[PDB]
Design a protein around this ligand. Structure first.
Ligand SMILES: *[C@@H]1O[C@H](CO)[C@@H](O[C@@H]2O[C@H](CO)[C@@H](O[C@@H]3O[C@H](CO[C@H]4O[C@H](CO)[C@@H](O)[C@H](O)[C@@H]4O)[C@@H](O)[C@H](O[C@H]4O[C@H](CO)[C@@H](O)[C@H](O)[C@@H]4O)[C@@H]3O)[C@H](O)[C@H]2NC(C)=O)[C@H](O)[C@H]1NC(C)=O
Ligand SMILES: *[C@@H]1O[C@H](CO)[C@@H](O[C@@H]2O[C@H](CO)[C@@H](O[C@@H]3O[C@H](CO[C@H]4O[C@H](CO)[C@@H](O)[C@H](O)[C@@H]4O)[C@@H](O)[C@H](O[C@H]4O[C@H](CO)[C@@H](O)[C@H](O)[C@@H]4O)[C@@H]3O)[C@H](O)[C@H]2NC(C)=O)[C@H](O)[C@H]1NC(C)=O
Ligand SMILES: *[C@@H]1O[C@H](CO)[C@@H](O[C@@H]2O[C@H](CO)[C@@H](O[C@@H]3O[C@H](CO[C@H]4O[C@H](CO)[C@@H](O)[C@H](O)[C@@H]4O)[C@@H](O)[C@H](O[C@H]4O[C@H](CO)[C@@H](O)[C@H](O)[C@@H]4O)[C@@H]3O)[C@H](O)[C@H]2NC(C)=O)[C@H](O)[C@H]1NC(C)=O
Ligand SMILES: CC(=O)N[C@H]1[C@H]([C@H](O)[C@H](O)CO)O[C@@](OC[C@H]2O[C@@H](O)[C@H](O)[C@@H](O)[C@H]2O)(C(=O)O)C[C@@H]1O
Ligand SMILES: CC(=O)N[C@H]1[C@H]([C@H](O)[C@H](O)CO)O[C@@](OC[C@H]2O[C@@H](O)[C@H](O)[C@@H](O)[C@H]2O)(C(=O)O)C[C@@H]1O
Ligand SMILES: CC(=O)N[C@H]1[C@H]([C@H](O)[C@H](O)CO)O[C@@](OC[C@H]2O[C@@H](O)[C@H](O)[C@@H](O)[C@H]2O)(C(=O)O)C[C@@H]1O
Ligand SMILES: *[C@@H]1O[C@H](CO)[C@@H](O[C@@H]2O[C@H](CO)[C@@H](O)[C@H](O)[C@H]2NC(C)=O)[C@H](O)[C@H]1NC(C)=O
Ligand SMILES: *[C@@H]1O[C@H](CO)[C@@H](O[C@@H]2O[C@H](CO)[C@@H](O)[C@H](O)[C@H]2NC(C)=O)[C@H](O)[C@H]1NC(C)=O
Ligand SMILES: *[C@@H]1O[C@H](CO)[C@@H](O[C@@H]2O[C@H](CO)[C@@H](O)[C@H](O)[C@H]2NC(C)=O)[C@H](O)[C@H]1NC(C)=O
Ligand SMILES: *[C@@H]1O[C@H](CO)[C@@H](O)[C@H](O)[C@H]1NC(C)=O
Ligand SMILES: *[C@@H]1O[C@H](CO)[C@@H](O)[C@H](O)[C@H]1NC(C)=O
Ligand SMILES: *[C@@H]1O[C@H](CO)[C@@H](O)[C@H](O)[C@H]1NC(C)=O
Ligand SMILES: *[C@@H]1O[C@H](CO)[C@@H](O)[C@H](O)[C@H]1NC(C)=O
Ligand SMILES: *[C@@H]1O[C@H](CO)[C@@H](O)[C@H](O)[C@H]1NC(C)=O
Ligand SMILES: *[C@@H]1O[C@H](CO)[C@@H](O)[C@H](O)[C@H]1NC(C)=O
Ligand SMILES: *[C@@H]1O[C@H](CO)[C@@H](O)[C@H](O)[C@H]1NC(C)=O
Ligand SMILES: *[C@@H]1O[C@H](CO)[C@@H](O)[C@H](O)[C@H]1NC(C)=O
Ligand SMILES: *[C@@H]1O[C@H](CO)[C@@H](O)[C@H](O)[C@H]1NC(C)=O
Ligand SMILES: *[C@@H]1O[C@H](CO)[C@@H](O)[C@H](O)[C@H]1NC(C)=O
Ligand SMILES: *[C@@H]1O[C@H](CO)[C@@H](O)[C@H](O)[C@H]1NC(C)=O
Ligand SMILES: *[C@@H]1O[C@H](CO)[C@@H](O)[C@H](O)[C@H]1NC(C)=O
Ligand SMILES: *[C@@H]1O[C@H](CO)[C@@H](O)[C@H](O)[C@H]1NC(C)=O
Ligand SMILES: *[C@@H]1O[C@H](CO)[C@@H](O)[C@H](O)[C@H]1NC(C)=O
Ligand SMILES: *[C@@H]1O[C@H](CO)[C@@H](O)[C@H](O)[C@H]1NC(C)=O
Lengths: 317, 173, 317, 173, 173, 317
């Protein structure tokens, strides 16, 4: 009689369809998903240092809007800005807002050092009803609104050397009055000029008198500027009025920090990859959750599924 | 597909083989049996694990990047930010699509290869004692009990022991 | 005697050469071209809505140069600017011209809504011999050149709320006089100032008196600016002279519109992919016609030919 | 190339086979004939059509982009616009070159595979009734008329019917 | 790996073959000899040179580009310059990694192929005069001196000359 | 007895490890390196035309700082800027420095043509102790510091047509005085204004009086601007003071020139690919020396080694 010996291979009742170079649908015994397509919906608070902005934008926390006093000197890996944030101080604009937001975000710190500027000849600490701190009229905590002393505002010519190892970031501003009265009451003279300079740079700004639509009842504006001063360089501030002076400098660091816009809640959990939709697992090489990511993340692709065969062709009985 | 064994000269797979990917069925005097071949099974699995090792858990860290959503109309710089991102995403999407298509074609081919290699090795082992029937089965022309079949599966079968019996059965009229 | 049975494969007398991983020239039985390298030389008018600019740039059609009156309120998928275009109105410049051109191009509409600004105290509708419309002196149709009423030009402080669902685009300008006479005749006073503001933004511009090379006999210039006003925000225009006022707003849309520079004729035909050289077929995945494209187009590559084998190796008898 | 049939042990192709890509020529008592094998032919063609389905008519829509030609000198922003575009084009040009080279190597290999698979299937069908001559031809050791050849081409040949005749012819002195 | 010869049914390579990549060892009445096969050797080498021709000495000229290092903090435009460059480098790094992995898998496979093709060609040449032992060696069932072995290596061996001797030795009891 | 015939393949005692799709370490008989990872450390002077900046930045050589007089009218393929470079003339800044540096770098020439501007009414050739040329007080060689003639500085209104085939590049500047005295001594009047214009463009700049930190003892500054004038256009300079005038124009070319920051020495040798670390061989397709390159160069990758198999799997005895 003899014998029969048959060579063969397994099969499964429930195969999965994959794509190949020659066939868009071929059934294999098993496959695995290469595109991460879901999130829990929370931003995990570990292992990255998360700073929830709550009601505050980064720029508001920088300038020192009263609601942002809790942010002083804080550090982050990722600053999270919420869509409910709003400003509640003197109305302002920042020419090239996006750049200042970016450079502070990537620096990753609000560390601020007070300096004693020689402001002799003027009244310091000007305040406004549009910027309430603890029921009192107030102002941005990091800024010093200078006004007349006994109806004179003499020329200011003030210097501050950088003897540190690091770059200093100075934030400052110009007051644009709504009317003639808004120029006379604080400075009691026709017109101001501001020149802020270093060995390597200069910025001059002229106040422009004129009505702007009222914001929290104020038709004036502050325009915010910045100046980086290198080690061994010197800051020079030369003003005849309308100067919103710095109280000191921010430390500028380099490292891995950033900023993200998200309304996802922060959770107590541990995930390396953050998206605005929430943290996502990072086992897969690709993802279609969000193009915006932070951390050790899969690469964003347009496909919502890509199946890698992990078994042979399935040829059921 | 490219070797012609899986979905080719092997008519179909075996749903009842659950302890390996490749194997042997036999019919002899003592009945009909099945056993998995662990070495071919492990060869295929090790290759697939090699691909997975190159794809799973290998992500890159990125930190501060460019903005990718905008609430205002701005023109030239914004157009460039958006175009850079769109360009990047299309290039990665292409990479991903091609990677999976190529890898899958290759997985199908390497699994077919392992089947073919096992078949060929078995054929050579049997020498003049068996003939290939064309469907992945050999007709063995001698009495071949459970220990004899075991010997073929373990690579220890001595064809000389049965050659006289087999030649006489094969080359009969 | 028995028999002989031979297995084999076809071959052709006229094979084609392709590239592979191991050989730069191997002959196969057939191949197909993957790079589109030709055009008919016409831009097909279907299925995209084409707007031929003819003598007009997009910016001229926007401002309302007299030769561009036929463009009022038109929409496009693709605006086509011709190299023969020229301006024929008051000479002007647009700081960041390229951005305004871009944002209007992508909006895809010249839809304009007139608004009634309260211009009491000045003479409206100033005109010039450099801007002829129907034999008469005229001006840009979308702009309102304000001048003195009885040798006075009082301060203007005019407001316009945005109560719409969409962003409004305001185009406006400043007149820079060529001489002292070009300042006195229209405004009859020393110097103008313009501040255009919203809740979220402000732009101030000062006229600069001075001779520029004459263009169509005019040594003065207009400088063109723009302001987007969001729903619920308010436009504020504050001027003491030299204001080229808006007559209303443009609708700003988002969608798939763009602009292309081309001298190709428009034809009556149907093609999804437009290049400046003409429409091209889009059956192939790649093309080397032009890096500039619009629509469902092959991807631009540097190669002028890439042949995909569609048959076996050719091994002639 | 990789299987060794096309441009290998098959000396050359047949210009006179115009109704298929693979086939059979024979010589027997009734003459010399040729017939295409439709199943191998269709197997190769279906795979090539699979590639074409992934390459032809699959373009992406793009609309407003960045500017790519400039009439004025501008410096930094223009340098960046040009570099982004040049970067993109080089990356796509690379993708295109590699795609075609890989696909072409694979097409040559899969067509060789189909030839080899047909040869192997025919060899197994003939069992002990024929010998392989090494050039893609079998010497069949029995009278094999047109119906018999047809039976081999259609997969219906019963080797047992001719085995006694063939063994006697083969193993003669 | 995919054909099963190199690191498969051929147990190991020969360190003493220094004049070719593939070859023959024999044992006969006149001793034990070794000779390289130049045609298989050249086939493999030509394919590898084809890859090298596509990779070595093929660089692109670039001239003025964007800046890629910065001494000052600047924000938005600088972020975009850095991101464009980082994007480019990651895409090229990916291309390079994949290219080498794919090419290396293919080189290993094409070299295994050439070994298999030589084995198959030799097997067919010997017809009924030899049997495959399963380890890349043939048992030749006739007296086969140095000139006879030479004939097999040169593709000139006439199997009919020895067939009677071989059949008688093979099919003995 | 018969014979035995064995088929086989070579092996080597010293194989090399490569990566594949299925195995991260497999030994082959031979391999070759695809990533160039070393340089000699010199920039080869051939075959590209190298211009070693030595103590001079490109911008200093352009303006004509005294130490850079040897650079007049030179051309380059690659300009090499050294970290030891320093300015030794009147202190200046260039708004959009990086753009001017770029456009000159890519033009690849310092070819300068003198023009005779009609400067009647003022004193030409103003000099300073901060800019010593051959022991004498001097100034930037390509710039003309205009001052009063007999305590008057009349309005300047000067024209220069472009009748050439090429674009002309004009470099010019404004003097910002440190004090009132620095305005009176040179111009002897209250305030200057500069308007530089063409048919297609206009730039106006106002001097801003104010103390800046002293650089080489000078608290004033010069701000540098540029203007490109097309064929058939006309340059117009209109000033009332503080103008740092051009002496002519630079030719602007297009071609393959660039600029690189490097401290590597220039050597007498021949290499097509330059990096800031030195020239590198270009036989390999990839390199990990530097992302910054010039010439026919391998493509920068992050890996420091990628080995291509050039032989079979190695299976030693
Ligand atoms: C179809 O194909 C896939 C891929 O080949 C198979 O899925 C794999 O299955 C194995 C074995 O079950 C899994 O191995 C286990 O991984 C666990 C970690 O899982 C998480 O993390 C990985 C990232 O590394 C993610 O991919 C995954 O989704 C999870 O989020 C370990 O915890 C497990 O360890 C267990 O055993 C060891 C002892 O050996 C112990 O040390 C542990 O304590 C624990 O008990 C284990 O290693 C593997 O994760 C799966 N891979 C993927 C990509 O999913 C399917 O099994 C296969 N299907 C069939 C029917 O065969
Ligand atoms: C060498 O290799 C190539 C690719 O394999 C072959 O070219 C293909 O040939 C087939 C059959 O002749 C072609 O099929 C026909 O396509 C027509 C549409 O053509 C246009 O559009 C496509 C995009 O989809 C473009 O690629 C192409 O260039 C054209 O611009 C259809 O109209 C045809 O349909 C006909 O038959 C059907 C019935 O089956 C009817 O419905 C129709 O009314 C009509 O009568 C047909 O489908 C195919 O387009 C070609 N592909 C390519 C990429 O070119 C060569 O034939 C081959 N050479 C040899 C000698 O074999
Ligand atoms: C392991 O694998 C590699 C790649 O297959 C082999 O390396 C090759 O070896 C060959 C033969 O020795 C080399 O060929 C020689 O190239 C020289 C030029 O070398 C430089 O330039 C190339 C770029 O083109 C660089 O890749 C290289 O690194 C060098 O910087 C020629 O000058 C040689 O010519 C000689 O012979 C000819 C006559 O045939 C004469 O015209 C010449 O005057 C001269 O005498 C020769 O062509 C080749 O460069 C190597 N390639 C690579 C990429 O390195 C190894 O040999 C191999 N190892 C083993 C043990 O096999
Ligand atoms: C430093 C200082 O002068 N603070 C004043 C401030 C400024 O003078 C003014 O904002 C400059 O533009 O003015 C404050 O009062 C004016 C303010 O009064 C409110 O009641 C009203 O709502 C506003 O429209 C405006 O008239 C201010 O709070 O801003 C007082 C402050 O001490
Ligand atoms: C609104 C208005 O004032 N329109 C005037 C216009 C302006 O005053 C002037 O352009 C402001 O710069 O001047 C017009 O005339 C002056 C013009 O006369 C031409 O003949 C000559 O070609 C020009 O050089 C110039 O002198 C004008 O057409 O521009 C009259 C217009 O009503
Ligand atoms: C063209 C001209 O006026 N040249 C003067 C120059 C300028 O008036 C001045 O730089 C404008 O700001 O002044 C020079 O002297 C003043 C200079 O004197 C030095 O001794 C001192 O070190 C400086 O602080 C300053 O007071 C000059 O050299 O700059 C003379 C020059 O002729
Ligand atoms: C310029 O016009 C605006 C709008 O009419 C004036 O602003 C309004 O002033 C009233 C009180 O006078 C406030 O109650 C409104 O809230 C203001 N509206 C806006 C939109 O700000 C502005 O006062 C005018 N300026 C001058 C100097 O007369
Ligand atoms: C400044 O100079 C320019 C050039 O000389 C003067 O413009 C010319 O004026 C004449 C009439 O006076 C015209 O015919 C020319 O067409 C003008 N040329 C150019 C290039 O515009 C200009 O008038 C002078 N300005 C002053 C205020 O005197
Ligand atoms: C404004 O302040 C600066 C700093 O005190 C003054 O500049 C210094 O002037 C002295 C001589 O008066 C020089 O020796 C120093 O080198 C200068 N220092 C710097 C940092 O420049 C400047 O003179 C003051 N300006 C005015 C107009 O009084
Ligand atoms: C098939 O079913 C088993 C058991 O339910 C499951 O574990 C496996 O993942 C399934 N496989 C596929 C390919 O769906
Ligand atoms: C944020 O603002 C909202 C709205 O006024 C308020 O209800 C909430 O208490 C504020 N939260 C914090 C943390 O200040
Ligand atoms: C700077 O301060 C000095 C010294 O008081 C003064 O002379 C000068 O006018 C000031 N300049 C400005 C622009 O405020
Ligand atoms: C993540 O958030 C974005 C917001 O733009 C949304 O469009 C996207 O679909 C979300 N994805 C998932 C998986 O929730
Ligand atoms: C073959 O190996 C298995 C171990 O898996 C053993 O149980 C069996 O008895 C062996 N038989 C022979 C004949 O070697
Ligand atoms: C060869 O010739 C035929 C008939 O003229 C033609 O249809 C076919 O496209 C040609 N093939 C090649 C590869 O040139
Ligand atoms: C465009 O301008 C040219 C040149 O002046 C003129 O001949 C033509 O009629 C104009 N076309 C239109 C459509 O206005
Ligand atoms: C704005 O208009 C108001 C009211 O007429 C006036 O007091 C003010 O000076 C104007 N400002 C400007 C800059 O024109
Ligand atoms: C398309 O137009 C461009 C204009 O730059 C030209 O350079 C290119 O060669 C043209 N291509 C074709 C195929 O006509
Ligand atoms: C084989 O099949 C063909 C149909 O294509 C038929 O004409 C022929 O007669 C068949 N012959 C046999 C022997 O089955
Ligand atoms: C085989 O070829 C070689 C040439 O390399 C020759 O030396 C040898 O004598 C030949 N032998 C036969 C039998 O053809
Ligand atoms: C092995 O050694 C030889 C001789 O020393 C050398 O030429 C060759 O390059 C080496 N090969 C490898 C793979 O290291
Ligand atoms: C460059 O400056 C240094 C430092 O002052 C000096 O030693 C050297 O001689 C200068 N070299 C040239 C070429 O001017
Ligand atoms: C330009 O020069 C003219 C003629 O001298 C003069 O009237 C005018 O005021 C000057 N303008 C400026 C801004 O210097
Ligand atoms: C080249 O120079 C750069 C300077 O950033 C340095 O970081 C890099 O490691 C150098 N590379 C080599 C191979 O010397």
């Amino acid at each position: 009689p003899g014998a029969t010996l048959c060579l063969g291979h397994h099969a499964v009742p429930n195969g999965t369809i994959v794509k190949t170079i020659t066939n868009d649908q071929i059934e294999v015994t098993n496959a695995t998903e290469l595109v991460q397509s879901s999130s829990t919906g929370e931003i995990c608070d570990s292992p990255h240092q998360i700073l929830d902005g709550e009601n505050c934008t980064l720029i508001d926390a920088l300038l020192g809007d009263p609601q942002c006093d809790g942010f002083q000197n804080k550090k982050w890996d990722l600053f999270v800005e919420r869509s409910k944030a709003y400003s509640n101080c003197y109305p302002y604009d920042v020419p090239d807002y996006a750049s200042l937001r970016s450079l502070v975000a990537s620096s990753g710190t609000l560390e601020f050092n007070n300096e004693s500027f020689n402001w002799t000849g003027v009244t310091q600490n000007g305040t406004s009803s549009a910027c309430i701190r603890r029921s009192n009229n107030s102002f941005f905590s990091r800024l010093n609104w200078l006004t007349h002393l006994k109806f004179k505002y003499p020329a200011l010519n003030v210097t501050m050397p950088n003897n540190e190892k690091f770059d200093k970031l100075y934030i400052w501003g110009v007051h644009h009055p709504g009317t003639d009265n808004d120029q006379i009451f604080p400075y009691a003279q026709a017109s101001g000029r501001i020149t802020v300079s270093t060995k390597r740079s200069q910025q001059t700004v002229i106040p422009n008198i004129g009505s702007r639509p009222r914001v929290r009842n104020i038709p004036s504006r502050i325009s915010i500027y910045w100046t980086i001063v290198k080690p061994g360089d010197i800051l020079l501030i030369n003003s005849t009025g309308n100067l919103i002076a710095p109280r000191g400098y921010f430390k500028i660091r380099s490292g891995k920090s950033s900023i993200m816009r998200s309304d996802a809640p922060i959770g107590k959990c541990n995930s390396e990859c953050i998206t605005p939709n929430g943290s996502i697992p990072n086992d897969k090489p690709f993802q279609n959750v969000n193009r915006i990511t932070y951390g050790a993340c899969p690469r964003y692709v347009k496909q919502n599924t890509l199946k890698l065969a992990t078994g042979m062709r399935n040829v059921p009985e | 597909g490219i070797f012609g064994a899986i979905a080719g000269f092997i008519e179909n797979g075996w749903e009842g083989m659950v302890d390996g990917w490749y194997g042997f069925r036999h019919q002899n005097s003592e009945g009909i049996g099945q056993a998995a071949d662990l070495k071919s099974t492990q060869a295929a699995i090790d290759q697939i694990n090699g691909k997975l090792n190159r794809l799973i858990g290998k992500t890159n860290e990125k930190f501060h990047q460019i903005e990718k959503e905008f609430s205002e109309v701005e023109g030239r710089i914004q157009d460039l930010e958006k175009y850079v991102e769109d360009t990047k995403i299309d290039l990665w999407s292409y990479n991903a699509e091609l990677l999976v298509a190529l890898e899958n074609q290759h997985t199908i081919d390497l699994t077919d290869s392992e089947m073919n290699k096992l078949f060929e090795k078995t054929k050579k082992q049997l020498r003049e004692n068996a003939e290939d029937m064309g469907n992945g089965c050999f007709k063995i022309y001698h009495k071949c009990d459970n220990a004899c079949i075991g010997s073929i599966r373990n690579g220890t079968y001595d064809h000389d022991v049965y050659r006289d019996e087999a030649l006489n059965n094969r080359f009969q009229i």
